[PDB]
Design a protein around this nucleic acid. Structure first.
Lengths: 50, 215, 114, 113, 112
RNA sequence: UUGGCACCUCGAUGUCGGCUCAUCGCAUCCUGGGGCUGUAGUCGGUCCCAAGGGUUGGGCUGUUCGCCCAUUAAAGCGGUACGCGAGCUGGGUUCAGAACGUCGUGAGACAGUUCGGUCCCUAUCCGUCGUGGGCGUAGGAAAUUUGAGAGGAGCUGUCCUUAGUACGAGAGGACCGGGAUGGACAUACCUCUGGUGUACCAGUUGUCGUGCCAACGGCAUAGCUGGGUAGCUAUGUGUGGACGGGAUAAGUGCUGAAAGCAUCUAAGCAUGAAGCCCCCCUCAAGAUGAGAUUUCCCAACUGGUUAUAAGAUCCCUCAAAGAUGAUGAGGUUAAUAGGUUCGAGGUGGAAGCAUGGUGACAUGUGGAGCUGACGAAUACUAAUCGAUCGAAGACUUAA
């Protein structure tokens, strides 16, 4: 159907309380020196070594 | 009367002393130890705990629940019994076992007794009205656009709302259901299994607590 | 095993294509679901190639496209690929998660022969 | 096959039963206890189906008795069946012989081996 | 059941019957071997009679795992007592008919 | 119900009857308990208490009502916009066509009757059904629970025994007690009978390829056909509504004056329903009245803080769980999945060769070979290395 009453800009923000996106869950590569994403190949330099 | 914990292995069938074929559920129990003994003098009822599945010992990696944790091991070391999965309480048994855990073997049960077997039902997720509540379905062919949906969900404008208990689609199964007046075809000791007359709630490997009938 | 967003024989075709591409190239960058599924398909052909008989060559020939390398793919398998993996008992591949893809967000992995 | 289902039904698996097969022809002996007296009521028919479960395995025997074809489905390890005796053995080319549920005359026949 | 052209295994002139009602209980929707039904004769007619179900394609279970399926269905008309209105029964007939105190029928049958 | 009024709605409150789903009243159809009978018994009639559950399937009609058929313990009466069309139909009803009878000079109208005829919507709020997160419950946790309160279930038949006794010329024919077994309805499960089973096995048809034969592959509803494992199922297989209490309604009383007697009542004391509260099944401490038992953890500095502990996750392998999240099984100090090797079960005798035939083909090698989900075993591949969060316990009085 159609909305019977326009939504306040309070109820809106409450409903968007959970419209987050978490961080990826990354770590630092002990070889590359930088941040990789855990259980993935290192972006910067090469290896996985797991 | 001493109920036991066990694991539903499967179903098989046997042949009585008149060839009267019996379908029978194999429920295997082992390591049933009695850990704690609840008495009204400290907590207001009588009961005994029993643990069923042995776990490993405490570890420091310990990242999967295959290993006990330190509270669980303090609790199980009170009884000088290894940490265990599936601690469950038994009321209605006159407390006559030892706070020190002694093995409750299946030999507590004789064949010609009667049993009730509690286990969680088998899960079936979000199963809709016809499958979940045994509702009828709409006609299929005489120009109908109503096949498997629920019917109406109330009266018109003199109720003006849906009543609590209205049957609607949702998640199905998974409940703690109990069956009653089952019998024990055979208590196989030294293989540590019980054969019950019928088929009990829960999937395979589903925990089932056996006890004597309330009737 | 797990349906791959495809119809039945379309899925069969995709799996045959990937197993041929793998034993031709020795490593391919694919999607993680496709890699999980091809892992249990390209690894039942290396078994047939470690057997070596005529019946095994034909059971392998019925799950393997025709592409010449010059050799074939089947000669590649019952020839020089099956000999390298002569000692190990299964586990002839691996998957390496590259990470998310652009345009999809598809989880891209690199599957390969060990 | 679980090792715990098996090894608990070992007290029921029987050994005095021959090795028949679908397409074969058996005489099965069964102990009626109907009334107060028992008798060994033979049943002679062609084996149509033979499933397998170990201690849950069954088999079906069919016969066009007289204008009416009747199938009976026994378990193998029933302590009611005294003996099976294999009159014939036929060449059938398949496991379950369901086409014989729509054949009566020269069509519902079987070979020798 | 509730519309089923049973055949008559008993030479009472009727040769085919239509199941009109299954007797017993309010809302019973199916009858099996050893169950009085109300039927009407469709072939030789046109009158209501009460038959028993001598055979059945679905067969019975026999309470020991012994299923007995028949090739087709069949009834036998009954008098006020369980005695068959006719004279000769035809074809096989199951045991549970023998058990429901239809002894005058199982006698006449060619083989059980 | 048929009406009366014309108070809300004509900037729209959608019709009758069926389908799905129900829920409420009691003026009770059945089952439960009684009084009185012109109640011998069986069977009844009429009142009285009782709403716990149950209350059929067809023919004809758009039909409701209504008649008939075959049963049943019974085939209740009503309200909820004559419940329910943002849940379904659209048969009749009042759209445009056409025709009949009738009326009209006529265009056209029905007292009518008949054949044909677009039923729109992506759910914002409340409501209901499931399922998560935040904070709270004066330290941080893990586990087991009590249960205030809420929900479910609650139906009945027929045989045999008392006993052919009681009552009755005879006919007939029991109350109360005891079992067996069914219908309908719930519910759990897949051993069994069947169903399905689009990464299983086999047969066969056309045509196109793998250079050719043999062997296979593509497409043709999964080309078609015969079987069918795990799982999901009912029509299959188990169990349930038992047994008892406490207070009661109609009712029957016991003692007893008011009223020297009579009196079930005013004092007082008993008995007495499928109904009430229990018992049985489930959910439940956000029960802010936030319960309880066990176990674990607890130090270094500046009024307070810190990272850390026990513990829990992010991330990964998964399924007995699943829309997602959550719930479970694991994360190498490892059997979580895949592979490999053995099985089970399924199909049903692989290719190659040899032989017998001129050929289609047949026999042996050989219960052969292939085998998704089922069982074990084996670290061969992958669950790496890592990171995030998370206490050190306020204030009075009393002992």
């Amino acid at each position: 159907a159609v909305p019977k009453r326009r939504t306040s800009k309070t109820r809106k923000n409450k409903r968007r309380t959970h419209f987050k996106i978490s961080v990826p869950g990354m770590t630092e590569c002990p070889n590359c020196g930088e941040y990789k994403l855990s259980h993935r190949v290192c972006k910067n330099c090469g290896s996985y070594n797991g | 009367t001493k109920g036991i914990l066990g694991r539903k292995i499967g179903m098989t069938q046997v042949f009585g002393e008149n060839g009267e074929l019996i379908p029978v559920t194999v429920v295997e129990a082992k390591e049933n130890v009695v850990l704690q003994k609840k008495t009204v003098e400290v907590d207001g009822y009588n009961a005994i705990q029993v643990g069923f599945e042995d776990k490993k010992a405490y570890k420091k990696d310990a990242k999967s629940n295959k290993y006990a944790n330190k509270p669980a091991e303090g609790h199980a070391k009170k009884a000088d019994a290894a940490p265990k999965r599936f601690i469950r309480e038994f009321r209605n048994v006159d407390v006559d076992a030892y706070e020190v855990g002694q093995e409750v073997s299946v030999d507590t049960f004789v064949a010609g007794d009667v049993i009730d077997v509690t286990g969680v039902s088998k899960g079936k997720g979000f199963q809709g009205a016809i499958k979940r509540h045994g509702q009828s379905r709409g006609p299929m062919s005489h120009g109908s656009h109503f096949h498997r949906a629920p019917g109406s969900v109330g009266m018109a404008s003199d109720a003006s709302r849906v009543f609590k208990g209205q049957k609607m689609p949702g998640r199905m199964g998974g409940n703690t259901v109990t069956v009653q007046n089952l019998e024990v075809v055979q208590v196989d000791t030294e293989n540590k299994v019980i054969l019950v007359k019928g088929n009990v709630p829960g999937p395979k490997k589903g925990l089932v607590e056996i006890r004597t009938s309330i009737k | 095993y797990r349906k791959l967003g495809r119809t039945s024989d379309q899925r069969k075709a995709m799996l045959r294509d990937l197993a041929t591409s793998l034993i031709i190239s020795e490593r391919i960058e694919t999607t993680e679901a496709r890699a999980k599924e091809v892992r249990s398909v390209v690894e039942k052909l290396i078994t047939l190639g470690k057997k070596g008989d005529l019946a095994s060559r034909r059971n392998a020939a019925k799950t393997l496209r025709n592409v010449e390398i010059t050799q074939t793919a089947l000669q590649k398998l019952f020839g020089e690929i099956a000999e390298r993996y002569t000692e190990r008992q299964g586990g002839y591949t691996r998957i390496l998660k590259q990470g998310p893809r652009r345009g999809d967000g598809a989880e891209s992995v690199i599957i390969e022969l060990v | 096959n679980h090792k715990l289902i098996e090894a608990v039904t070992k007290s029921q698996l029987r050994t005095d039963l021959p090795s028949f097969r679908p397409g074969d022809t058996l005489r099965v002996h069964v102990r009626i206890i109907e009334g107060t007296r028992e008798r060994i009521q033979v049943f002679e028919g062609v084996v149509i189906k033979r499933r397998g479960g170990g201690v849950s395995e069954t088999f079906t025997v069919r016969k066009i008795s007289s204008g009416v074809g009747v199938e009976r489905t026994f378990p193998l390890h029933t302590p009611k069946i005294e003996k099976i005796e294999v009159k014939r053995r036929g060449k059938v080319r398949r496991a379950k012989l369901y086409y014989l549920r729509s054949l009566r005359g020269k069509a519902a026949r079987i070979q020798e081996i | 059941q509730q519309e089923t052209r049973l055949k008559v295994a008993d030479n009472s002139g009727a040769r085919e019957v239509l199941t009109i009602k299954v007797l017993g209980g309010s809302g019973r929707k199916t009858a099996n071997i050893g169950d009085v039904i109300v039927c009407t004769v469709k072939n030789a007619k046109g009158d209501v009679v009460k038959a028993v179900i001598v055979r059945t394609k679905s067969g019975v279970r026999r309470n020991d795992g012994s299923y007995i399926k028949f090739d087709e269905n069949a009834c036998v008309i009954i008098r006020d007592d369980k005695g068959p209105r006719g004279t000769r029964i035809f074809g096989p007939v199951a045991r549970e008919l023998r058990e429901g105190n239809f002894m005058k029928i199982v006698s006449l049958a060619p083989e059980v």
